[PDB]
């Protein structure tokens, strides 16, 4: 193909969007933005498929062009805007705020947060570099650049950005005993305490994470996102607290819920 592609097929779209195989040939190709194509959630998917606020893409367009949706405190009118991990979606007309946080099944949840929690977010620092008269710069997972970071912040750490100002307020080091989410791979959406890190020079480091329920798993270092200091998260967790139940336990819980409900 010559030049960039501009379409995304319905069946070739990311699976975690949970799209049909009969409601059209195309899936909304997310715009270029702070998050990768396969790791984002387009605004049209969130407003139409998730929140049911629209029944068509035209209604999503109307909602977005009335300037009602803020992403990280800034109004976005792009219906294919790539919203991703740790982002904040504010709808002041209905007075709600959501955070984009993975379920244990690896899918972005509809996780409502308080209006005072929507004033900040967490960003994993992807790199730190000194430029142009020795000014340190930091690049996070939102592709946002922060000048003059704390000289203690290193790669793989987490920083709490104030959305109003864009400045760093606090940070969590990447160390054992710290809480972390998994943002990719088979264990995507799981939360647990870092127990170990195997360094593999010239290759991918492997980080071992222990669940709150004693379960253990491993991921690549790029798939780890430090959520809180110690075992206390700095953000509100979804319904499941990052505990991946086996299929049997999920079936048992569903049967208990059926018994209690009908």
């Amino acid at each position: 193909a010559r030049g960039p592609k501009k379409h995304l097929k319905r069946v070739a779209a990311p699976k975690h969007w949970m799209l049909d195989k009969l409601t059209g040939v195309f899936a909304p190709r997310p715009s270029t933005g702070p998050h990768k194509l396969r790791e984002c959630l387009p605004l049209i998917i969130f407003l139409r498929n998730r929140l049911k606020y629209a029944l068509t893409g035209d209604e999503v367009k109307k909602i977005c062009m009335q300037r009602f949706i803020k992403i990280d405190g800034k109004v976005r009118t792009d219906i294919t805007y790539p919203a991703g991990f740790m982002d904040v979606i504010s709808i002041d007309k209905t007075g709600e705020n959501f955070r984009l946080i993975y379920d244990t099944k690896g899918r972005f949840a509809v996780h409502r947060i308080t209006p005072e929690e929507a004033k900040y977010k967490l960003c994993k620092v992807r790199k730190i570099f000194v430029g142009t008269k020795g000014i340190p710069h930091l690049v996070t997972h939102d592709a946002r650049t922060i000048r003059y970071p704390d000289p203690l912040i290193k790669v793989n750490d987490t920083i709490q950005i104030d959305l109003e100002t864009g400045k760093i307020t606090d940070f969590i080091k990447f160390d054992t005993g710290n809480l972390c989410m998994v943002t990719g791979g088979a264990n995507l959406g799981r939360i647990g305490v870092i127990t170990n890190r195997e360094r593999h020079p010239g290759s991918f480091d492997v980080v071992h994470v222990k669940d709150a329920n004693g379960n253990s798993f491993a991921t690549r270092l790029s798939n780890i996102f430090v959520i809180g200091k110690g075992n206390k998260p700095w953000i509100s967790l979804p319904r499941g607290k990052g505990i991946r139940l086996t299929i049997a336990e999920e079936r048992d819980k569903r049967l208990a819920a059926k018994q209690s409900s009908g």
Partner: peptide, 30 residues
């Protein structure tokens, strides 16, 4: 904004290196 950020980072950096020098001196002594 450039002036304010430079001054604030100079202050923070000076405090960081003072703490680092204190830890280094105390590690050397013990």
């Amino acid at each position: 904004k450039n002036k304010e950020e430079a001054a604030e980072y100079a202050k923070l950096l000076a405090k960081r290196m003072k703490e680092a020098r204190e830890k280094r001196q105390e590690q050397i002594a013990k």
